[PDB]
Design a protein around this ligand. Structure first.
Ligand SMILES: Nc1ncnc2c1ncn2[C@@H]1O[C@H](COP(=O)(O)OP(=O)(O)OP(=O)(O)O)[C@@H](O)[C@H]1O
Ligand SMILES: [Mg+2]
Lengths: 368, 155, 71, 48
């Protein structure tokens, strides 16, 4: 008898589960239809509080109104500089929002920096020490600077020939320091709408202040930092103002990287904006050996590798040149259909990359 | 004794639940078609900005005016993200469509659709350069195994 | 060359965006880039680097068997 | 015109970029045909 009873009972259980699913579907439909009745509210920044009830809001890219808070919201927190929603029938204040993130900035924070560790950068030990002393330690241990009473340096400038590790340095600092990181390609700041770039810089620094601890790494600074096309200068002015606005208390630090520091406006060079500078030179003989040993490390090679001979030949290389050396050696091994790598591949690769360096009509670089 | 203690129970409860299920599915159909008629599309394509709790979104329109939505709308919060493209109601500005991101017309014009036909045999004397370009470009696209077995970054 | 001749800095900024969309912060894999020029002496020492354009492929004057093959 | 959504090749839902005014997701009238319109195409659009 139990088989028929089980058939009907299991069908009842299945039907009740199906009815629960159908109930969830009905609640989805009813709830989203109820949402359809809702109407969007107008966003806008606020200004002087004329009275305890009359306020001057300024709708984002819009007119300037005088409006009142709804009935119940706080009035003290309604200070000049609080994003608030406006009812788009009477424009009354309701729902003061925290602040704008400006998804440009969201992209400028939630960007993958890689797994780069300090043990992957080579030959820059002194420069890593400086950067960690100016940007990591003031953030990790602010109480040191509190008790000592020293105002920590606001930011560091990284400069050097193209392909020596500046961007790598920033990548490592981002990947190792558990904080909020802001990386910027400076040309990304540039926009064709009137005065939008200055707003972008202001909002970036406001996000920096809102989400401490944070590091701001604007790269290729010369793009918006060249010596005094109009909007770029007006935006450099806003960058200067926001930089000088750094009170001693924020856990906010900043890195700027460039390959042509000479073109940089001397305004930045003044102490109090970017004081500490670091020259990331072409790797030394020992530095070149370190860089090569790091990059060629994971290569499945056989036999002895004479890194010192390659370093002897690799005069004047950057780090990218040595990374190439490894890549070209691997490419030669692949062409020869060898599942492995040996010394001759490295020899051929370094000779090839030297021939390439012949093309790279590397100008003499002079610092700031 | 057996099978007689449940006859009146199994033969009526399931029928009632089935009737309720039929009526409830009908109610779903009406709510869905009310959504459908309320889904006529002049949409005001707009960018999403950071979401809030008190799950609810901020929108920047193509007309360069910002709105807050008490409820995001017919899309789910987990789908959306900052700097997204959403089609919103032309008047109430509620989000009711999620759009594929559009970069620019020129960028799409840069895409090759005709797929030209010049063969490698049509190139003369350049065999070394041909081999260099092929090993640099095509091989990473083709296999990725010969490179990863070596641990090198492909050019 | 970055410092040219300067109201051309817009070209410099676009070129810098290209420069960092080839190797900077976030890596870019599976997107291969091919470039062609006749005046490599003009180009940057930056976008002529080794991390961005790993291979520099010289296209010489056709040799005489190359010329016969081309004909 | 822009980004022909063509989510099913049955309800195409083309995007438009009316210059200096706005951008909309919109559909064809009963006269024009899907084969007529392409991406770009500088289409014409009713006013309401
Ligand atoms: N000290 C180093 N240790 C390990 N790898 C290095 C080192 N220096 C450079 N490299 C390698 O060389 C390349 C340098 O690229 P990166 O973008 O970091 O250079 P950069 O000089 O800071 O850049 P930019 O020209 O954009 O200013 C990377 O592929 C990196 O792995
Ligand atoms: Mg860089």
């Amino acid at each position: 008898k139990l088989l028929e009873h089980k058939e009907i009972d299991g069908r009842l259980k299945e039907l009740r589960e199906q009815l629960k699913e159908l109930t969830k579907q009905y609640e989805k439909s009813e709830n989203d239809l109820k949402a359809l009745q809702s109407v969007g509210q107008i966003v806008g920044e606020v200004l002087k509080q004329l009275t305890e009830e009359k306020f001057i809001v300024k709708a984002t890219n819009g007119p300037r109104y005088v409006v009142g808070c709804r009935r119940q919201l706080d009035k003290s927190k309604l200070k000049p500089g609080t994003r608030v929603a406006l009812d788009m029938t009477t424009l009354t204040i309701m729902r003061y929002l925290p602040r704008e993130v400006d998804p440009l900035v969201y992209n400028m924070s939630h960007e993958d920096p890689g797994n780069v560790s300090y043990s992957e950068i080579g030959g820059l030990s002194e420069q890593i020490r400086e950067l960690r002393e100016v940007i990591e330690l003031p953030l990790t241990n602010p109480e040191l600077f509190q008790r000592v009473g020293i105002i920590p340096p606001k930011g560091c400038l990284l400069y050097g020939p193209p392909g020596t590790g500046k961007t790598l340095l920033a990548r490592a600092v981002a990947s190792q320091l558990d904080c909020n990181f802001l990386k910027v390609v400076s040309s990304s700041i540039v926009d064709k709408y009137i005065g939008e770039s200055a707003r972008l810089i202001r909002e970036m620094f406001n996000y920096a202040r809102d989400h401490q601890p944070c590091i701001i790494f604007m790269d290729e600074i010369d793009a918006i930092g060249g010596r005094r096309d109009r909007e770029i200068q007006r935006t450099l002015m806003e960058l200067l103002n926001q930089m000088d606005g750094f009170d001693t208390l924020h856990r906010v630090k900043m890195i700027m990287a460039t390959n042509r520091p000479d073109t940089l406006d001397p305004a930045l060079l003044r102490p109090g904006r970017l004081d500490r500078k670091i020259h990331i030179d072409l790797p030394n003989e020992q530095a070149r050996l370190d860089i090569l040993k790091i990059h060629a490390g994971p290569i499945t090679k056989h036999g002895e590798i004479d890194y010192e001979a390659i370093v002897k030949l690799s005069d004047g290389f950057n780090g990218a040149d040595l990374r190439n050396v490894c890549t070209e050696a691997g490419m030669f091994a692949i062409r020869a259909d060898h599942d492995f790598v040996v010394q001759e591949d490295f020899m051929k690769a370094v000779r090839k990359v030297a021939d390439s360096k012949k093309l790279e009509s590397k100008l003499d670089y002079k610092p700031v | 004794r057996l099978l007689d203690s449940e006859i009146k129970i199994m033969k009526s409860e399931v029928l009632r639940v089935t009737h309720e299920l039929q009526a409830m599915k009908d109610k779903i159909k009406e709510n869905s078609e009310k959504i459908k008629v309320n889904k006529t599309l002049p949409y005001l394509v707009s960018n999403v900005i950071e979401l809030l709790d008190v799950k609810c979104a901020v929108i920047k329109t193509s007309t360069r005016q910002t709105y807050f939505l008490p409820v995001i709308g017919l899309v789910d919060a987990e789908k959306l993200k900052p700097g997204d493209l959403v089609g919103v109601n032309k008047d109430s500005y509620l989000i009711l469509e999620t759009l594929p991101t559009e970069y620019d017309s020129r960028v799409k014009a840069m895409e090759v659709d005709e797929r030209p036909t010049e063969q490698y045999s049509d190139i003369g004397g350049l065999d070394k350069q041909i081999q260099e370009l092929v090993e640099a470009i095509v091989l990473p696209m083709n296999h990725k195994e010969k490179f990863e077995n070596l641990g090198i970054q492909p050019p | 060359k970055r410092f040219d001749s300067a109201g051309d800095r817009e070209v410099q900024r676009t070129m810098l965006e290209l420069l960092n969309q080839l190797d900077g912060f976030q890596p870019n894999t599976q997107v291969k880039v091919i470039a062609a020029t006749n005046r490599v002496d003009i180009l940057d020492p930056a976008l002529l680097r080794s991390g961005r354009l790993d291979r520099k492929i010289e296209f010489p004057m056709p040799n005489e068997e190359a010329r016969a093959r081309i004909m | 015109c822009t980004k022909i959504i063509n989510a099913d090749s049955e309800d195409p839902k083309y995007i438009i970029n009316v210059k200096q005014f706005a951008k909309f997701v919109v559909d064809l009238s009963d006269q024009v045909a899907p084969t007529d319109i392409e991406e770009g195409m500088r289409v014409g659009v009713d006013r309401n």
